[model samples]
Target: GPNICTTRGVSSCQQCLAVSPMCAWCSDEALPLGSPRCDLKENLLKDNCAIEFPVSEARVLEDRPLSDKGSGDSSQVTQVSPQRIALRLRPDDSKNFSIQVRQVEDYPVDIYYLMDLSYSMKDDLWSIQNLGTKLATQMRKLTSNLRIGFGAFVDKPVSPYMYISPPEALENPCYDMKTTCLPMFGYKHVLTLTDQVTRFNEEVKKQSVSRNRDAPEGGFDAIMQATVCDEKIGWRNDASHLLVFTTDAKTHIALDGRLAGIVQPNDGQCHVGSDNHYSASTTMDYPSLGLMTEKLSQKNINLIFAVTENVVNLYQNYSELIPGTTVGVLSMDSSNVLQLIVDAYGKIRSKVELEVRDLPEELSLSFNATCLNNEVIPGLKSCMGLKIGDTVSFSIEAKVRGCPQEKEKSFTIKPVGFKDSLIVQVTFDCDCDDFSCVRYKGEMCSGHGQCSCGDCLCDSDWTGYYCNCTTRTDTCMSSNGLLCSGRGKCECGSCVCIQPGSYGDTCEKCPTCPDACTFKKECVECKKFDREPYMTENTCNRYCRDEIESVKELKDTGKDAVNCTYKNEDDCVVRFQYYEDSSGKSILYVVEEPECPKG
Candidate 1:
């Protein structure tokens, strides 16, 4: 990791800082030649470099103080402290901050009770008829201002779902019980949200059980209506809205209504008439689960499915598809309906679940809920078992991958089921001005590289401040057409020999090495003895660049003379002496005859 700071190709401050967060650049001009200006922060400091180099750090662009008291003003009511915040962030860097979320005491509560009114639930109807007053009284303990609404649902009135052909059966599907049954309907909103418990009870008492032919009820239709009919159902903007769905049988989902020849799908609109009944029930199919979940979240409604034991597992499985929803088993007679509402309100409000909305695809957000007792849980977004006035602190970390074109962007941190949210405005901390292309000789990077941060980010084929110099080494080729004489590498249009004793252009000069004799041995052997494993006469005349003469014995011309020997294929010994004259030409003297051993 430390080596990245000093790695090659990182020759500038911006490049060094981009390498690692620990890296910094020394701005000290007094640093000696060949000293690294880019290195680790501690290393630079240890080298007595200044500590005020450029580094990315988090900063508060704008912060509003955390306010606890709403002062009875609807606009001032704040459940999430520090409601507005703006931050400065950098690429590959993360910033962590804590936010306080408190469930305000006596927050306005709105609860809508949607019940199944099929004939099988006759006993359950009597149980809930007396529940409105009791539930309001019990819920008043948690919130002083509470409103309750009531709605009822039966299966869709159609051929397969009901007895429509026989007039007598259509009038009284409960003929087996010797009692009249109410006309089958899809869903009826008997009451909107109201603070009066007597009104809720009065509407419940007027409701009568109806019969349908199927085992599944049109409850998904009821849910979709209740969620999307916000204005008709009297949903409050500042209250915690809860939709308590109560049923005894398995519910019908999307496409089930197709058997009844209802082809059009639920439009997820307020189809309820002025009479407070779903008018599109018979015309449209049941809403899909995906559509239901979307509307539920969009309207900020928490759903509670209070079902009998037979369908408890079914509802429980699909409850996860929707957020801010919980499942509870109910007694057959609905005796526990009041307590169930109370427990559901407590359970739904006791926990805080945070989620980020409208996050850009280039960025990622992770949350850690720091609950009471300082327990640290990674990747946990929700905390449980909180009571009224209890505050939960969440630590959120956001890191962005790619650079954004916009200097400033924003996202939302919303607590599910609550109306309050934290709007986080973000400004990327970077040199946006310097990132643009700049001109060198009226052309950027001399058309060879990209310009970045007022510097040239050179291509692999070029390197320089202006990226105008070619990194290729055609000029470093020797007269023999071999680059660096096959002994060195070309760097900056020059040859840098790797051998210790090699020097000169293309590493052609090695005065003390034995390569000189090695280069001349073959030509000498071919000239004097015309031996095998030697060059041909034509080859020697073309390649050999020296003067050669035969003598009775070898002789040296100067103190710089070189001695060489060769053994022929016949085991005959030949000797030669070669030296460079003052004019820089090679002259060689060889033995006219060879000494041989008897074979």
Candidate 2:
């Protein structure tokens, strides 16, 4: 254990400490001793433990617990094309509604492999180094565009969980003085998603097993970073993102980082260093399952937990907390990683659902799926019975009760398992039939009719809502064919002459006297006795006409006197008002006073 630390080919200063207790790294950019320059905490913090023992390119075959034979093996490698579909929804009212959700077949796919690098996983790592390349080759048949990336984690660097007694500190679990390994690191982004299959193999082949002492590795910590650090991994916003996690043991959760004095909670934000170590390694607690699940959901990352048969149940249980996760049984050295990935892809494809978010409370949405087999299902949120290259239809129904606080509402609906989702930009129903159908007095339809669609529908056989000569003799439609004989409005299927001189159902009668003594007019205003005629009579005489003359003409000539309409000046105070015509009929008239008593 002590010999490999000071030995020639140890990978890094951190690795050197893991191998031998007396070994240390000098972080100073300055010169070092044979060396004790990296002996102190401040020194390690300065250059970050780089040169005290120095780092080299390769490790000796005999020094590693498992000598990876083809260390230089390398190339690497979207399913689904144009993976996004959008929907715009605006409902007129609370009735049946629908929106078209188009999901095209054969979309490109992108998958990222994030593995465990703990000591127990060494054998597994050796078996699947080229898994991405193989998986990419297989996936090309499913899609034209496919990308793959690699990332990994071991354990956080801290005490209790590591060997910190220096001359040097050891984070890897291996104590085999004859066997050395790369120090445990919190997480690292080895490669970004790439179409080149050669790059996938090349990077994966370069990684060696890192050993950590604890049974609970920082698997969640690694997942947390890879998910949030989408940019660091060069995740394409246009493609499906997947994370494949392979481990032989359970994960460290919530309180585990406390053993290492890491008290701060995992922020679910990316804090990985350029060298693939956690920047806040000793400062944060292990990520909680809730935190991990939230980030996964936010990024729309589908996770596959590839584990040994024994730990499959544990991971499957974990998957319950995280939606869109699949647990696969891994064989020795991970010979099934390729199968695990391929199946997970297909499984997720076959079961399709939607994810709706940020929708206004006023809006509601539901969907049904029609499969390739012509099987139509109702009220389901996802696509059912779908296979690769099989077209599916999602009948989405979305509506709003009224309007959002804002004028227009925008929301998103993404397929639960795919890369694309439907963005809905909805313009709500902001306009309704004009406030009311009232253009004049009386109810809509003059109270004798029903109002709808901005207009009144008169009843009782009443015609236009206007005055008489419109309806009938008993229904406001008389000789003039107007409502109330051009005198009053018809209300609720009844004649409402509602004026003084104009009387009867069709406004055919007026008040009468034996002589010209009855100068009767509907008094809607005060009358002035001194007002005159010719000077345009201000006592409402200009508009008021004598009805006695008309009655007498009716008794003599069998018809009213001349229906001589009063042609008063435009500026005269010709007043119109309503009253009862002594016969108890609603009536109205243009009052023509009797010469204002010759004033």
Candidate 3:
């Protein structure tokens, strides 16, 4: 634990910093000859040495003060601070920074009402006729400036959709009820987005109910027109745009127009004529929900599906398919639409979500938001329960698995509905320098190993200061033709014994397994009693010539002595004890009396 910082062979500053964050490199030239130049930061500080450390920092390069003024004709507003920043990153190192997002008071808003004007929506039209004036009055409490527009849709004027058989049927589809009905059309852009609420009311009242043979109306077609026709509908670039969709019946999507012989796909373009009517209604098919969702996201418009209770489930499914969409249940006659608009607007305004743009494929970003309630939520891009003038902060962290070739990259972050953004530029500080490997003594590990810092890592069957010596076991071979006597390892040029309580040149002295006494037993028997038929006095003198001392009777010798008993062929009992002395010479002491069998 204490010596972790003193890297043994760290000779260069770059290698020292690459080892660990706690390590530092000293550049002092006058230190001791054998002193370590690379060590822990604390050790360097204690020695009063000059040290270098790698660091990662984030700097805000351009921090314009937050502005929300109405000075110029179309002044720019900033909801986020530190619009431009520069960051330095290293490999596998994490850097953290924060961004502040505040909701401005009295933000500009634009609402475009797209309604289903089919025959079944006869009562709903009356409620919508007075909607513009009332909604403008109520919405002023939320925002300082507001703009409204109106658009309507029936079904396709074809045989399968609308009654087109007789002249009277084509002119007025509601002829059976003796009521005046406008010619069936797909969609009509009635009014452009204007600040004057009176214009919205007049335009909405001028719309007449039309009849369709089928139950489903061309609502998706109307939504697609209201979204893509941005300039024609006067959609502003700096406002929170809302497209209110009110209907009572289910909608016909793409491929359904094939039943009416309209095979050409919806081109998803602005097709409004100079007369404010959808001119390509009979030429193009209905649009798919996928197309409608994409256009709504590109235009940054939140869609509100104000549908009746009978079709709430259907519109709820549609809302799920589209992002930034909400559903509200309406009364049979839409008399309660005023409250629905207010509630839906408040629900959309109470939440704030952010989106990132132009992110590199290899880089990833994570966010931790501290919302108005001061609760920290990990990996959250959206916050709830926010109001006007409420400010929230987000802690953002970025991680790149590897450095890019460009060295510098840029990305943007902004709230989902707002137009302002936070731009960031990052430079990958790889710190790629020379001396990734250090050499020593005019040779790199004696050409036998790899060098890291200044030390050599030897390969298998090699061990030395320079890794030049091969760890061969021939020097440790015993006379018995066993390496280290099969009880230890041969390291460097000698034997290192492994067995406990065993010691010798070749590790042959093992007390736990078989001691020297066991091997000397047969020799002692032949020398003392001449036990074998082939063993005579001269045989003992020739083969068993170890040192021996005869005793009159057996007694305790010492702790290191081993006692033995043997019976000769003459049926006589012989007992003795043998041991090895300090000089490593085997000695045997035998009892003089040999007990013979009784006659």
The model with the greatest lDDT is: 1
Expressed as tens digits, the lDDT of each residue in 1-599 for candidate 1 is 34666773156765565555556676556656355676766765666656534444445443443344333564566777666667665544667776778877778889999989888777888887778888877887777688889888987878888877576655655766667788788899988998887798888787889888788999988998888888888888888888889988988888888789988988888799888779888999998888887788878988899888888889878886665688777778888877787768877877787867777655656566676546564445666657766778898876654356664588888788777788887766533343467556877777876665456665544667887776555567564434677577667667889986789888988777766666687877777657645464344543464678876554555687877777877677777887874323467888777688866
In model 3, which regions exceed 4 Å deviation? 1-57, 65-75, 164-172, 175-177, 261-267, 283-285, 431-599
lDDT value, residue 20 of candidate 2: 29
Q: Which ten residues in a row have the lowest lDDT in candidate 1?
A: 62-71
Predicted candidate 3: what Cα RMSD to the true structure?
Answer: 33.5
TM-score of each model, paired residue for residue: 0.63, 0.54, 0.61
| lDDT per model vs. reference | 0.74, 0.57, 0.72
lDDT of 3 at 591: 72
What are the runs in model 1 whose C-alpha is more than 4 Å off?
1-71, 168-178, 263-267, 320-323, 429-599
- Once model 1 is optimally superposed onto the true structure by TM-score, how far is the C-alpha of residue 554 displaced, in angstroms? 99
Model 2, 166: alpha-carbon shift in Å? 6.3
Which residue pairs show backbone clashes in model 1? Answer: none
* Model 3 weakest 10-residue run by lDDT: 431-440
lDDT of 3: 0.72
State the lDDT of candidate 3 residue by residue for 1-599, as single tens digits. 23545643254654455455456666657765345666766666666665346666778876655565322354467678778787766543557888877776677889998888887778788877788889998988878788998888987777888786776645656777677777788888888999998898887777788888899998888888888888888888888788888899988889998988999998889898788778888878998878887677767888899888789889877776665688888776788878787778766776677777787654557667777345564545566556666777888886553456554688888777767778878776544222443344565665655554455555444546677666455566564334577577656547789865566777877767755555566676666656653264334542354666677665455787888776766678777777675323567887777788887
Which one is best on TM-score?
1
